[PDB]
Design an enzyme around this catalytic site. Structure first.
Site, short mmCIF file in Angstrom:
data_model
loop_
_atom_site.label_atom_id
_atom_site.label_comp_id
_atom_site.label_asym_id
_atom_site.label_seq_id
_atom_site.Cartn_x
_atom_site.Cartn_y
_atom_site.Cartn_z
N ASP A 35 5.31 -2.10 5.32
CA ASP A 35 4.45 -1.52 6.78
C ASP A 35 4.50 -2.42 8.12
O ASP A 35 3.16 -3.34 8.29
CB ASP A 35 3.22 -1.00 6.56
CG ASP A 35 2.51 -0.53 7.28
OD1 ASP A 35 3.42 0.57 8.18
OD2 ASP A 35 1.40 0.11 6.89
N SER A 199 11.56 3.02 24.06
CA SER A 199 12.82 4.10 24.37
C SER A 199 13.18 4.12 25.31
O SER A 199 11.87 4.92 27.02
CB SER A 199 12.68 5.09 23.57
OG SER A 199 14.24 6.17 23.66
C1 LIG Z 1 -1.96 12.80 11.95
C2 LIG Z 1 -0.91 11.61 11.52
C3 LIG Z 1 -0.33 11.20 10.69
C4 LIG Z 1 0.56 10.00 10.19
C5 LIG Z 1 1.61 10.59 9.36
C6 LIG Z 1 0.53 8.57 11.10
C7 LIG Z 1 1.28 7.90 10.67
N1 LIG Z 1 0.46 6.77 9.50
N2 LIG Z 1 1.18 6.05 9.32
C8 LIG Z 1 0.52 4.45 9.05
O1 LIG Z 1 -0.50 4.25 9.37
C9 LIG Z 1 1.48 3.84 8.09
N3 LIG Z 1 1.48 2.74 8.80
C10 LIG Z 1 0.69 3.02 6.59
C11 LIG Z 1 0.74 4.71 6.12
C12 LIG Z 1 -0.97 5.34 6.19
N4 LIG Z 1 -0.84 6.31 4.85
C13 LIG Z 1 0.04 5.77 4.03
C14 LIG Z 1 0.36 6.44 2.90
C15 LIG Z 1 1.26 5.30 2.28
C16 LIG Z 1 2.35 5.12 2.81
C17 LIG Z 1 1.49 4.51 3.81
C18 LIG Z 1 0.80 4.56 4.81
C19 LIG Z 1 -0.86 9.24 11.96
C20 LIG Z 1 -1.02 7.79 12.23
C21 LIG Z 1 -1.47 10.48 12.31
#
Ligand SMILES: Cc1cc(C)c(/C=N/NC(=O)[C@@H](N)Cc2c[nH]c3ccccc23)c(C)c1
Length: 330
Positions: A35, A199
């Site tokens: 990650d 970007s």
């Molecule tokens: C409203 C919203 C929705 C999403 C999908 C994210 C992404 N977040 N992604 C992460 O934090 C990843 N770097 C790690 C991660 C978070 N949740 C996970 C669940 C499964 C596998 C990896 C992650 C954000 C910041 C805000």
């Protein structure tokens, strides 16, 4: 030294990628989600609340002769999507693709949120952002990359994610057979602890390129591509029947559609995401509504170049004294 490990999609949609990691002596192999958007290496373990483990492989420090409890240290992380985990800390030997770090902080989960419990294929996360984000208290710990860096042939790692196929994480070297053309390097800000870059713009399908600065993070741990609402609206406007659904939680489109590509700028260079990469399939089993792989970052607070974007490129995370990011087509 160098390391090279294969990374594999956890399902048919490339929702995430797992990479085998050897921890302890004798080795306990766990499949971790690498990650670049976080900086904790944490694992399901023998200490994890039993009801919160559902099929994961666990790290058992008591069975590792090189495991040592890091006295008094705890950790707790909240990810921007609402997921979380927490626990205590060991140090132990950690190897990735032949590259070995001794005394790596291995964060043992006592508690994990439902999202992690429900992901039976993910045994933990391996953070590859900057160590300033690491959550270990009262003594902050270094990432696997930061610990390995001085020993590497070159202070870099690369992400080569596959579309519906395995890919590769390399440490310490750039595989010049893994991409086409040249790698275009671009500046990185570490002020928020992320691999944050700007970007130079975008195109939708065969449309004209729009020159516009888009600041965002290169995040291998995020599935989709999250961009400003203006950009995302311009993309979905080219898909008949596409719309943003509050009930679903984003843009959806008729499963019968053929999606246009999406191009993003890296300096004067261009990375093209094929339309197929943007299809995340039926919103529920049997539905004719499909979920889009490009979504609005409004309310996230940052733009996220997740797997949808990264898997279209060979990506160099250059951890030299002044870090930079490189992108090549492949
Ligand atoms: C409203 C919203 C929705 C999403 C999908 C994210 C992404 N977040 N992604 C992460 O934090 C990843 N770097 C790690 C991660 C978070 N949740 C996970 C669940 C499964 C596998 C990896 C992650 C954000 C910041 C805000």
């Amino acid at each position: 030294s160098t390391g090279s490990a294969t990374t594999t999609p956890i399902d048919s949609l490339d929702d995430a990628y797992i990479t085998p990691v050897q921890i302890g002596t004798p080795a306990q192999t766990l499949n971790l989600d690498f990650d670049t958007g976080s900086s904790d290496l944490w694992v399901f373990s023998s200490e994890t609340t039993a009801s919160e483990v559902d099929g994961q492989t666990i790290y058992t420090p008591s069975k590792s002769t090189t495991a040592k409890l890091l006295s008094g240290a705890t950790w707790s992380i909240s990810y921007g999507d609402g997921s979380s985990s927490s626990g205590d800390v060991y140090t132990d030997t950690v190897s990735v693709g032949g590259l070995t770090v001794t005394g790596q902080a291995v964060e043992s989960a006592k508690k994990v949120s439902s999202s992690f419990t429900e992901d039976s294929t993910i045994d933990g996360l391996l953070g590859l952002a900057f160590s300033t984000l690491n959550t270990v208290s009262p003594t902050q710990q270094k990432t696997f990359f930061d610990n390995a860096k001085a020993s590497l042939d070159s202070p870099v790692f690369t992400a080569d994610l596959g579309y519906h196929a395995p890919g590769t994480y390399n440490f310490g070297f750039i595989d010049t057979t893994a991409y086409t053309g040249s790698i275009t390097y671009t500046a990185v800000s570490t002020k928020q602890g992320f691999w944050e870059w700007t970007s130079t713009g975008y195109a939708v399908g065969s449309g004209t390129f729009k020159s516009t600065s888009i600041d965002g993070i290169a995040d291998t741990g995020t599935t989709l591509l999250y961009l400003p609402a203006t950009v995302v609206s311009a993309y979905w406007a080219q898909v008949s029947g596409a719309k943003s659904s509050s009930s679903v939680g984003g843009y959806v489109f008729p499963c019968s559609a053929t999606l246009p590509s999406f191009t993003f700028g890296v300096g004067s260079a261009r990375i093209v995401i094929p339309g197929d990469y943007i299809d995340f399939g039926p919103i529920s089993t049997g539905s004719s509504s499909c979920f889009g792989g490009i979504q609005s970052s409004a309310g996230i607070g940052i733009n996220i170049f997740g797997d949808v974007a990264l898997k279209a490129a060979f990506v160099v995370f250059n951890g030299a004294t002044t870090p930079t990011l490189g992108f090549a087509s492949k």
